[PDB]
Each structure stands twice: as C-alpha cells, then as structure tokens.
Amino acid sequence: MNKDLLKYLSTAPVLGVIWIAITAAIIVEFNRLYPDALFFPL
C-alpha cells in the first residue's frame, strides 16, 4: 500500500477519529447485545 497514503492515515485527526469510532462501536455493540447493565452481575 502506498507509503504517502499510509503516512496520511497516520496523522493525529485520522487516527483519532478511527480509534474513537472503533471504541464507540465496541461500547454500542456491548450495549446492543447485553443491555441495561447497571452493575456487574456476579
């Protein structure tokens, strides 16, 4: 893959957005599949 493009994908805002979006997705998907966890079940 093109090195200049890869360098662009490594810039702070691009990595910032991608990483936050993945994190946000993980939280969304946990809450979509295991909803309403007010506490750890034990």
Partner 1 sequence: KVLIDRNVVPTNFEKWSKPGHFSRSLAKGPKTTTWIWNLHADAHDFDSHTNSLEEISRKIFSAHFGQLAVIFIWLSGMYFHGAKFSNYVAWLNNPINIKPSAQVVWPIIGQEILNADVGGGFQGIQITSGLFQLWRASGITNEMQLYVTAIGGLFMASLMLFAGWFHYHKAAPKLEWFQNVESMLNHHLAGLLGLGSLGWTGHLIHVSLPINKLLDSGIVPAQIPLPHEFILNRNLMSELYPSFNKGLLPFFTLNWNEYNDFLTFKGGLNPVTGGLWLTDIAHHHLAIAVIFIIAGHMYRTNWSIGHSLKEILDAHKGPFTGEGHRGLFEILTTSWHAQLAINLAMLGSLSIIVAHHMYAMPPYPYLATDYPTQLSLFTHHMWIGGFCIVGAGAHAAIFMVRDYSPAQNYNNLLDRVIRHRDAIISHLNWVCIFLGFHSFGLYIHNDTMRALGRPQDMFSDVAIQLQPIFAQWIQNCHSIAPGNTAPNVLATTSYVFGGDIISVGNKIAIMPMSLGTADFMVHHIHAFTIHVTALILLKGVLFARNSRLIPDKANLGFRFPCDGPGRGGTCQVSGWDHVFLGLFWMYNSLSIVIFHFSWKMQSDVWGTISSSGDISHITRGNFAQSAITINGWLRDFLWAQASQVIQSYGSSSSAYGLMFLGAHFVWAFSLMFLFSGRGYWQELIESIVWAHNKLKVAPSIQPRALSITQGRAVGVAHYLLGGIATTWAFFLARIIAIG
Partner 2 sequence: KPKWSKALPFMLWPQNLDGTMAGDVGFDPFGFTNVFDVKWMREAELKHCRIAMLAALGFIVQELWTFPYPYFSKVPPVLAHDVYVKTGGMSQILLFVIFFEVISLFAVSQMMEGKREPGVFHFDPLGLAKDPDTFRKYEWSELRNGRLAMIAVGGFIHQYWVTKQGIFEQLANFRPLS
* Torsion from C-alpha of 41, 24, 26, 40, nearest 10 degrees: -10
Q: Does 42 bind partner 1 (CB under 8 A)?
A: no
The footprint of partner 1 on residues 12-31 (CB under 8 A) is 28, 31
Has 3 been labeled as part of a binding site?
no
Give the list of residues 6+ apart from residue 31 with CB closer than 8 angstroms, or none: 37
1 binds, among partner 1, partner 2, none (CB under 5 to 8 A by kind): partner 2
Q: How far is the CB of 14 from partner 2 (least distance, A)?
A: 17
Has 29 been labeled as part of a binding site?
yes
Q: How far apart are CA 8 and CA 15, in angstroms?
A: 9
Binding residues: 29, 32
